[PDB]
Amino acid sequence: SMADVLVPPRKKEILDHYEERADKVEKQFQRGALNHDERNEALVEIWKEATDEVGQALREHYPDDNPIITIVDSGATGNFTQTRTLAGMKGLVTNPKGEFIPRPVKSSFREGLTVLEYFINTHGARKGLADTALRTADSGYLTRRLVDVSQDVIVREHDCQTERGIVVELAERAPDGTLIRDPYIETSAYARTLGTDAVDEAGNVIVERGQDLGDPEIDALLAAGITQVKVRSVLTCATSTGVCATCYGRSMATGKLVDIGEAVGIVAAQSIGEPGTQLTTGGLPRVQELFEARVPRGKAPIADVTGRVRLEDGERFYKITIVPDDGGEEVVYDKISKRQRLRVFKHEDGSERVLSDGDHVEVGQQLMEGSADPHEVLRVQGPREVQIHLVREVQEVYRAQGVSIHDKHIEVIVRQMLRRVTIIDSGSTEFLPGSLIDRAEFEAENAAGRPVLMGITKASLATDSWLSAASFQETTRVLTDAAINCRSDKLNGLKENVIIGKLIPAGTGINRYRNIAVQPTEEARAA
Amino acid sequence: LKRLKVVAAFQQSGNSPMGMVLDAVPVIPPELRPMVQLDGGRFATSDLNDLYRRVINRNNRLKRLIDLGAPEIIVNNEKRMLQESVDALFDNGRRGRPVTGPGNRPLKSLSDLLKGKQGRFRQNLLGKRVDYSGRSVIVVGPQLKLHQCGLPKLMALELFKPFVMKRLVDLNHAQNIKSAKRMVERQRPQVWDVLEEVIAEHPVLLNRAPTLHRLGIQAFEPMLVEGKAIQLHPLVCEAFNADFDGDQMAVHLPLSAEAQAEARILMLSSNNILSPASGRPLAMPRLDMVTGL
Amino acid sequence: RPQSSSNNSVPGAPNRVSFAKLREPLEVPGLLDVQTDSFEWLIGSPRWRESAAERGDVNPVGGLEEVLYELSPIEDFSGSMSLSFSDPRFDDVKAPVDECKDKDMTYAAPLFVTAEFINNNTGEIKSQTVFMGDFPMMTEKGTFIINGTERVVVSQLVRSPGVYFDETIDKSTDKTLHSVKVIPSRGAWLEFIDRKRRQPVTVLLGFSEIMRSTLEKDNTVGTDEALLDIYRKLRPGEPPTKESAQTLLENLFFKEKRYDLARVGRYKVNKKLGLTEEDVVATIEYLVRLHEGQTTMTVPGGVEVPVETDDIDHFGNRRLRTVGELIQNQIRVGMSRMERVVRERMTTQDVEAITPQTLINIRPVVAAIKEFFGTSQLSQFMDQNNPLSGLTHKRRLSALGPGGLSRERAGLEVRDVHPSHYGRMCPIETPEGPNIGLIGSLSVYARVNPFGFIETPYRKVVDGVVSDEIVYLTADEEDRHVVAQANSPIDADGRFVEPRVLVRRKAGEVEYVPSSEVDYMDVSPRQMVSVATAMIPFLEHDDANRALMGANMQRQAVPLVRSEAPLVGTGMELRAAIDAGDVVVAEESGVIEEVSADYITVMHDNGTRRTYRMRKFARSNHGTCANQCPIVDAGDRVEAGQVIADGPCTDDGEMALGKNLLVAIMPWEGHNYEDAIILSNRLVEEDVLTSIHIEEHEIDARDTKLGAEEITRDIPNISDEVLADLDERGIVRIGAEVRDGDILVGKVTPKGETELTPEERLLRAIFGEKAREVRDTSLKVPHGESGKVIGIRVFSREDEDELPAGVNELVRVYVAQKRKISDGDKLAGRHGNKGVIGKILPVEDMPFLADGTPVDIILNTHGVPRRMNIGQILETHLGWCAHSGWKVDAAKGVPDWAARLPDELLEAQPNAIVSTPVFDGAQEAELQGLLSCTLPNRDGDVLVDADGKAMLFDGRSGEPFPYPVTVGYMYIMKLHHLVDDKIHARSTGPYSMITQQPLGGKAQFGGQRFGEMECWAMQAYGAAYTLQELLTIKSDDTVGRVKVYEAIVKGENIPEPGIPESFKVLLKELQSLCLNVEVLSSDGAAIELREGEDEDLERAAANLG
Amino acid sequence: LDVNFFDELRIGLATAEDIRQWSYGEVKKPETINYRTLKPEKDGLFCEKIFGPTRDWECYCGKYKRVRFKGIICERCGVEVTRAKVRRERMGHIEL
Ligand SMILES: [Zn+2]
Ligand SMILES: [Zn+2]
């Protein structure tokens, strides 16, 4: 009801007060003592503060049994920003270019907007609708490339019995005796198979390896004071093609251990792409930047080796040299712009500070603030590090938007990124130099090769199936190369089998479930 | 190295490089490039017929020029036109300005059939139009159980039509199966009991586009419902992202015992409560339900 | 009538009292003027002649006159003769509008011109009247009839010709570099040539220092080197002559036939610089002054020229090509081709016997007009769901089409609202889909320039005193003066009451300035909104997205069998309906002489008579029912402009798109869950949401391979019972009730003897039957269709009826359906609130007021607050007031909340129609006050309290709902998304001859598309047999589908799937690409894919015995 | 008639020998169908002598229309009497 929409009693006085502050900023700009960008910056801070204050007074005046309050505070629907826009004020509205306009909308849609306020609001509304219309298309494209890279990954066996895994933080020890729970427990620890037994320093193993790590297991682990747990994941899985059920762990839908026939690559692609329309490099293009293994914009270098750092100070850009402690030659970086801030971190002496002159740096420590290049992390820190890095960064983007995706889904894609190596030296074998060969063929045919990180698209086009590669992208090129090379498609995969009308090699289509003898027992035939 | 990849490719594969130059051009069967007359006497051909036709005319004029002993400049012009027309036949616009039809529209070449989202790879292979399927607007189903969906009577009668005919000939309502078809098509009153019978415990698949995750398709037990709208259970909306603003959904009828078993077991609505991504409950209450509780 | 009543200027208008507190200085112009004024300009009509005399240039030139003056000096290479044109003249119309719609003709009038030939050798002068072809004419409604179908030419948004400057920040050093472009009307564009990259700035020849270092890259010697480099750089063709290619290159910057100076463009570059080559030089000087920032530009003779960047999305740089200019351009093309034919016919012919008739060939002109109205993306099928959709369609401003920009090339920067759109293009109304920002609508008061720029009226202020003088300003002119909002206190003598008024800054910012420094003021608060947007009550209380949806859905409302004007309007309804044209208006004052459902005739005071024929149950383009009814009686006196007859969606002259429904905002038993809407069965029983929908079924009898088809009543294997409703020709009879599968028009097609079944051939050979074998091709009613036959139209070759080649007989059957509101139909309010009916309850189930009145509609509470449309609540409150009437208490004097109310709103009778204009509407406090003084019902009970809430009983249990529920009256429209059209189902049906997949679409009885993402879903479930079954035996497996139907009909198991036809088609395409693709078995041999022919023959032969 | 035992799918360049082996004849004419008779012209893109008959068991000239003649090649018009289905599996060729 119009009566059920309550208006803040002090709204006029609040807005007048902050309008007096804004008038002071106006006089500051009139004297020439304020920059135009600084004028707009000060005004934007003023009206942000005012919108906050009318929001607070608004929530203060509303009884908690009011229907507009009840609907939001029960979690049923809506948020208080909408309530504040309705009853209190609309606030600052965006430019066509995306900037905040220095004059806020002081009206609330209960009062009704004036002509100019409404006209200004149309900018943000319009650009919002358009941005949704493009975002759905881009998210659909990323989902399609995730599907194409991951769709042949299925669970081919129960257990590969590997002892490899990753360390996952269950908590952090505060200065107080209290235990600060890790924010990532939901998407990292929970729903994993235990890699090694977690033992409290005071006694018996609380959770045995090969356990689901549910909420009871997490509560018993935390009550026992276990700050870390090593879990099995598909990143460390030893199965050549696909993954073992035990490394992938629990199926999120069923709550039990993932079934054999399950195709977890398509579930992973859909699980990553379905929220993608909520993502607003900081956004979804950062997710694409990570999955495509592109050298990031605003690249931050890392230390190639442990040693001392000589920091050169200059106006235009930073220049960094490093003298290694092993006795080797100095690794000299360069071309670090002054717009890039220095990395704040824990040094080896145990202090939390910014990178300064003459510090000591360990292997792989990030020198500059920004997004590190996963290709360099692969060379310096090894293959098992870039998996953790990529999963963590993608998870950073998806968590910053409030979307909950479990790590294993990202680990299927990331696992598909590392599957191959580069041949630098042919040696005795027939591999050509610079070529990208699968890790299984490279080790069985074995001579010199290095792990390679590939984008999901590049890794997709490199599949052994020309029929599958032709249906993804660059059909003409794929068919020309396949024709000249006289390629023979083995016709094993769920995209190839769909095309020719054959049962997909997953779920009910695998040979274990497909061919089965079913006959009644003698006791049942008797009755 | 880059030259070695292609030269070695032709060396090891047994491909004769002469295959890159053609003395004979294949012609696709006419059913794949049909010609249909429209209302108004006009005819409509696939672009392929115009491309093939240009190659034919220019080739025959080249033959006439060879016989006539024409100047080498004219014969050469005709040879260039022939090469360019075969180019337009295989991949149109890959070199030069594309061959256009009326309205200055570039014709679709043989390469265009294999490429893009509208080509024969994406939408003629990975997906197709299917029988035993329908669609309609969805309305809220609040009286439904989680494993059930309301099916409009006429929709169910069309979807299950063969089953209703068979069960209609089993009883004596229909003398034979042809008269059974005539009765189902005329919606004779005898078909509603039999329809309700064959519907029982026969699952159907519901889908709302776009399908973002596998929960975008779910299996339900249909029940005959009044009206022309599909009644959807309020707890699966979150999974389908189903708002009732006029959203529509599609129904598919599994036929074989394997398809029905997969629907009842794998895809059943009440068998997937939880997000396949986060494991959190989806079929959980929201909106009015939350408010009530 | 008082000032409070809206639409005081329209005679006989209903009395709708307005809450507006501001006087309207200027009335809304003709909402079709954007069409009619442009076309009258093209024709050179007397009306446009008068308007151009008053407000236009002293020398008027029409569009046709302009093309002829451009084309008049046609001279051959010798120059011994010339053919001139002049004086366009039009005959009367070939056939009237209704005859053109009925006969599938084109509404047109013959065009004639005066052609004069001069012979310089013998001095003869031959003047001849030449027929230039039938010229399609614009109706009074602003449309065209092309092949019997009504069409709208949408105005196109394009860039004006001129010179546009921009600065680009390079990736290297982030330096500032200014890139310039020159857009001609016709000819090749220039940059700082015609797609030729690497073009040197030096090859063409602080400020002179950067130009001087620019000149150091290449030395220049004489008039040779630069012109040779331009010659060889222009085209790769072998250089013929350096000098002659230099002069032929000089033809590109000079000749008006090649490089066409844009009249509008010349005005733009002149208004930019100075009052040719001097323009080019001044452009180099402008760029040089742009390299180093300058607020003044200098050139020879130039002065007072600012240096600035140019925003290409601004409405000073972005103009409209209206219908007249588009037609004029296609005419220019046709006339140019005809001129090539004329010059070609001049050089070779006998100069003594030539005539203008001989030289002129009108085929390319008529073919140009035909190709335009036929094939152009700007010539559009007129959208008539209701009058508002067609009206807004005629005011549509489109950025697409030839000469515009493509959908893919459109970025987010062209779509969003520009500050120069204020009062010109409505920021609210744009398509919600991929076309957002590419399609606008003209604002209510906006007007198109003779140059194509959109103006807006403004109130001129002299020394802080607001005057009544109106001035129309282009966005260019608007970016100089300071303009004030229409809401601001004013003295009774025209003075500004407040010391200072708020204003829009030139840059598109907001400022506060004293009244003496303010130039112009907005004429209306609705100045910026379009017509549909201005019909949304409490628009200011709704967020821009939801208001967009409301504006768009009003255009989707379907005409109901009976129209009811809204209790709560904005006042735009009347002028919207009148200007839309679908209402019948009296052209001259007089008395009604006679009135029938068929026609009204009015006797003028002159003794003259005028009779208006009513459109009765006419089918619109989209199938809605256009039905006019007279609102006048026999003795009535009417005035010029008064509405004689209501049309579709009109009540007493006002647009009525829906019904006033008693609404209750509350959750009800999950049936309104998630935007779903609950309705009372009364709306079905009393037909308040019922609409008529008319479908046109067409079938023809043509020549086939085996000979002519026949339309006949004699259909083999068909009972006399089902032929009952057919006439002696086999055509259904007027008034027949037809249902799903019924025969409309009987037709038979010749069949071959190889197509008979073996049993059919046994009968034919045994009884010696007729040699003619036919198949039953009769036109049948599609699935899910019912109605009565309201009309039949038949065309035959035996008469003079023009038919396409091969077509002997053509018959059309019109079927009218009465559609009652149903579960699945879509409803919406004007605020963007919308949903589908999820339940239609018995009247006794609905919540009812204490007096027993059941509510009509239940809207879910959870839907309202987060969509940010609170107007729907406000309207609801106001609705109830208007429903019940009110008496404000003046006994002790006017309360302070009613102080600003006009004296006419202090009381209202029950069911009072009321106007709440946008931005001027009913204020919160006034609405709250009206809620208190509401009149009681017939028993003296006040049903709705001061909050707008009532106590409701649950119609099911009987208990009262424990808390008061908001109730009132809301205006609800029935949208054109209707479950009767949407429901479709197929077990088995026709398949494509090409892909052998099921056909698509409901009209084709098609199957559902199971796409790539749905296959991803199937694979994620791991369902292999469902996926395979869908993509094989359910789609393109040709043997699998038939065997599956056999298996189901016989109660057997479904067989194993075969091979999809799609894979075979893929292989055939690969082979057609010269790719040798073989399917290898396990042993390495190539499998060959075919099918055995003997199986069908073995079963078919064993069938008989 | 065949379940899919397909082990693999091979693709390579087609020589003129392959194209001529695929072909059921050479298309020598630009004509499509006759405007009066709606019959495919001979040696055209729709020609029945090469791509197969348009109507089941009917040769182009009309001397043989019936199932008794199945498999024979008409000595007049050269059209095989068979199912028109073959019209989607039968390729022509053009001699350059
Ligand atoms: Zn494993
Ligand atoms: Zn023959």
Numbering used by the authors:
A (entry chain D): 732 to 1011, 1025 to 1190, 1201 to 1281
B (entry chain D): 293 to 585
C (entry chain C): 23 to 214, 226 to 238, 253 to 322, 334 to 1163
D (entry chain D): 2 to 97
Verbatim from the authors:
After forming a complex with the RNA polymerase (RNAP) core enzyme, σ factors guide RNAP to promoter DNA, open double-stranded DNA (dsDNA) to form a transcription bubble, facilitate synthesis of initial short RNA transcripts, and later assist in promoter escape. Mycobacterium tuberculosis has 10 ECF σ factors (σC, σD, σE, σG, σH, σI, σJ, σK, σL, and σM); deletion of ECF σ factors from M. tuberculosis results in attenuated disease progression (e.g., sigC and sigD) or in alleviated virulence (e.g., sigE and sigH).
Here we report the crystal structure of an ECF σ factor-RNAP holoenzyme comprising M. tuberculosis RNAP and σH at 2.70 Å resolution. σH2 (residues 22–99) and σH4 (residues 140–195) fold into independent helical domains. Lacking σ1.2, the domain that forms extensive interactions with the specificity loop of σA, probably accounts for the disordered conformation of the specificity loop in σH. As occurs in σA2, the σH2 domain resides in a cleft between the RNAP-β lobe and the RNAP-β′ coiled-coil (β′CC) and makes extensive electrostatic interactions with the latter. The σH4 domain enfolds the flap-tip helix of the RNAP-β subunit (βFTH). Surprisingly, we discovered another anchor point for the σH4 domain on RNAP—a C-terminal helix of the RNAP-β subunit (βCTH; residues 1145–1157). Our structure shows that the linker region of σH dives into the active site cleft and emerges out from the RNA exit channel of RNAP. This interaction creates an entry channel for template ssDNA loading into the active site cleft during RPo formation, but blocks the exit pathway of extending RNA during subsequent transcription initiation events. In the crystal structure of σH-RNAP, the specificity loop, which recognizes the T−9(nt) is disordered; and the RNAP-β gate loop is too far away from the σH2 to form the G−5(nt) pocket.
